[PDB]
């Protein structure tokens, strides 16, 4: 299974840095015991040398994560940005990905990474839904994401 609470979705204000984004999306996981207290710095350390920018066609998506040993329980944290924030390209292109949707992943097994990129494929697939993510409010984004990912893996 994987834990997905209502407070794991959050809109972020403008003028936020890449570190403040990661720190903000890790606070619910730290407060719920899903990860170690140092989980924010470990994700910042990985993103610096292993970026996770994905140039999705509608809006840019980022998937910051870290190794499994700093994760207690499986969970995802979703953050909607007010302005595009650059995450350097995970592909290898010299230019970054303007990201507006951030998925903070905390999986307990490295070999499940390929399976969690597949869950995000189910959210990314709908172009119209990615547009609605930027206009919906907090509880609207939670209900839509919960049911869309609930169609396969167990949640909460």
């Amino acid at each position, epitope marked *: 299974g994987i834990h997905f609470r209502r407070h794991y979705v959050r809109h972020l204000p403008k003028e936020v840095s890449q570190n403040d984004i990661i720190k903000a999306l890790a606070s619910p996981l730290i407060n719920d015991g899903m990860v170690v207290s140092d989980f924010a710095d470990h994700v910042i350390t990985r993103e610096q040398n*292993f970026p*996770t920018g994905l140039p999705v066609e509608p809006v840019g998506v980022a*998937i910051p994560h870290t*190794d*499994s*040993k700093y994760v207690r329980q499986n969970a995802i944290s979703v953050g909607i940005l007010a302005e595009p924030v650059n995450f350097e390209d*995970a*592909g*290898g292109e010299p230019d970054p990905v303007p990201v507006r949707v951030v998925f903070m992943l905390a999986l307990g*097994n*490295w*070999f*499940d*990474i*390929t*399976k969690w*990129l*597949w869950y995000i*494929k*189910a959210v990314i*697939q709908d172009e119209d839904f990615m547009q609605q993510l930027l206009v919906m409010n907090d509880d609207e984004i939670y209900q839509s994401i919960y049911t869309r990912i609930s169609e*396969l893996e167990v949640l909460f």
Partner: antibody
């Protein structure tokens, strides 16, 4: 669905290096993990490392302690395996393997286990 | 790491008997992270069972995996001449992969 084609057999002296390649076929190259498993003549299977090309994330068997380097060339859909400072006991058949997937196409659900295997590359280390 | 111990080393039976292979783990492995493989002489291994109990595509119904925690079992209901080979169990639960030593299923005459 997917075919894994590896490079030919290689003969190397002790202390040298081996770079085994593995070209993928029909199916998403970057979305699924590529693993390298070797097998000494008459013995069992030993995992060496895995890689996810989309994120360029590589996970190694810590017993090799840096002797192994696994890279992926996304443009040509080829994964590489480099084993340095070879010993005679490194003589084995080196297999390229892709994780299995439930379904077809871009929405094939990753499975974890190795469902697609390469034909294997014989590496002989001797003077 | 998680050590996998297979039993028995060799299984000697005639075609038509039931074949039961056991794989014991030193730590608990999640069922989603367990798999069985078959290898014939000269060929690469082939995936039989994944997720501890799910058959791979094209694997006949006479193969059935089961078990959880630390005890996993592979069963072959009616062994056939093309089922005689070496079977390896595999886990990949805690970010690392280990295999069993292998069980050779041989034709008993």
């Amino acid at each position: 669905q997917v075919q894994l084609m590896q490079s030919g057999a290689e003969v190397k002296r002790p202390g040298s290096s081996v770079k085994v390649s593995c070209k993928s076929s029909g199916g998403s190259f970057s979305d699924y993990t590529l693993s390298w498993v070797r097998q000494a003549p008459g013995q069992g299977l030993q995992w060496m490392g895995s890689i996810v090309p989309l994120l360029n994330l590589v996970n190694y068997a810590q017993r090799f302690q840096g002797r192994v380097t696994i890279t992926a060339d996304k443009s040509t859909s080829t994964a590489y395996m480099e084993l340095r400072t070879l010993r005679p006991q490194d003589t084995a058949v080196y297999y390229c393997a892709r994780e299995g997937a439930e379904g077809w196409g871009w929405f094939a659900k990753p499975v974890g286990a190795l469902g697609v295997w390469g034909q294997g590359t014989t590496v002989t280390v001797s003077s | 790491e998680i050590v996998l111990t297979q039993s028995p080393d060799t299984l000697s039976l005639s075609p038509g008997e039931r074949a039961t292979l056991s794989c014991r783990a030193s730590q608990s492995v999640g069922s989603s992270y367990f798999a069985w493989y078959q290898q014939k002489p000269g060929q690469a291994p082939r995936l039989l069972i994944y997720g501890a109990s799910t058959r791979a595509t094209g694997i006949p119904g006479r193969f059935s995996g089961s078990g959880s925690g630390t005890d996993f079992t592979l069963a072959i209901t009616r062994v056939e001449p093309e089922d005689f080979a070496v079977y390896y169990c595999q886990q990949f639960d805690k970010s690392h992969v280990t295999f069993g030593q292998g069980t050779k299923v041989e034709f008993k005459r």
